[PDB]
Amino acid sequence: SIMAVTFKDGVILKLTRVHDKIWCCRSGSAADTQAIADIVQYHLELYTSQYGTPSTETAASVFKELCYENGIIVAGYDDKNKGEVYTIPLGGSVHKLPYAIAGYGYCDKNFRENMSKEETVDFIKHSLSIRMVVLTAAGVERLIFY
């Protein structure tokens, strides 16, 4: 029902901006996951004020503090690294992954590292058998398909 995946220029992904280059994708309660994203957005704005722009590993770290009471996909980009995706499955467990989904082995069955945008966009449209966001060095891009 939700997906994130890495590709040559960054990552492709109930989508919400916790920072300009760090986005969250949500499942379960829209009330609780929006309360979490609003507090993560407050925390990353507060980190940015004191240290400059956060790493995506810091954003995943901030989500652990707030999800500790009650999983979510975290994804983003920075001027050094390639784009990244993290997951927090059932709470307490944590991973850093080239791709993630939530709601199947079908994903890894077709997935390929360092794909082009067009391959990955077709891959997600096939795998969701609607809105999609693309994060890169150059900027933020919005897509939709139905």
Binding site: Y42, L46, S49
Partner: protein, 242 residues
């Protein structure tokens, strides 16, 4: 008498502790200036590292509070860093409570209301600092707001603070008396910086190198502090202009 050690009125109706906190704003021997352009607001500060052992990239009084707002502090560096971390937190708290970026006027009111608590309580001292906040506010445009140890706050057309503030202020007033505008008429922040540096030079009599100045600029997008090389482009421009 006893009236001087805690914030309590003397027989004159004066709060002596607040007047002593004002004398801490003269303590650093630094002059600062802020001016409004057509589409930016610009802050110039003196920088005074006397002894060779200092690292001058660590001697700064320009603090960036949010994306779009920053400040210059006049008064002691420890109390300045205390004022800056509150301003950072309360601009991020306002964004969380109200869902839009903290406007400059409201940050000045908020910090001035906190300064009133310490200007009345007898177990909390006033901070020794004057805070000048600068932004391009999306409703009011180019903004300068100044907060002082008494919890007073006001908005300015231009402002100066330091030991020699009356000289700079006299030159600014005589400039706006010449043009009859509320602001510097230049349409880019480089030319506004070159104006403010020329007024700081004309008022304070010293020429500046890259090492003697600190500069900050607020625009629609961001607030940013100039590197010593970009201040050299500006001083080369004043030397190219004449």
């Amino acid at each position: 008498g006893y009236d001087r050690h805690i914030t309590i009125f003397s027989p004159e109706g004066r709060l002596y502790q607040v007047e002593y906190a004002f004398k801490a704003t003269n303590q650093t021997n630094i002059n600062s200036l802020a001016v409004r352009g057509k589409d930016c607001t610009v802050v110039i500060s003196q920088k005074k590292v006397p002894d060779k052992l200092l690292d001058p990239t660590t001697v700064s009084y320009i603090f960036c509070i949010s994306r779009t707002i920053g400040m210059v502090v006049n008064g002691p560096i420890p109390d300045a860093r205390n004022a800056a971390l509150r301003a950072k937190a309360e601009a991020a708290e306002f964004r969380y409570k109200y869902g839009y970026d903290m406007p400059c006027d409201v940050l000045a009111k908020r910090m001035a209301n906190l300064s009133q608590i310490y200007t009345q309580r007898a177990y909390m001292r006033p901070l020794g600092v004057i805070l000048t906040f600068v932004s391009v506010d999306e409703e009011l445009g180019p903004s300068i707001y100044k907060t002082d140890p008494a919890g007073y706050y006001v908005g300015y057309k231009a402002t100066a603070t330091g030991p020699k503030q009356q000289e700079i202020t006299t030159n600014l007033e005589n400039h706006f008396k010449k043009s009859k505008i509320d602001h510097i008429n230049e349409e880019s922040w480089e030319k506004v910086v070159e104006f403010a540096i020329t007024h700081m030079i004309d008022a304070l009599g010293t020429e500046f190198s890259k090492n003697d100045l600190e500069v900050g600029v607020a625009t629609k997008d961001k607030f940013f502090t100039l590197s010593a090389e970009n201040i050299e482009e500006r001083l080369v421009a004043i030397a190219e202009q004449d």
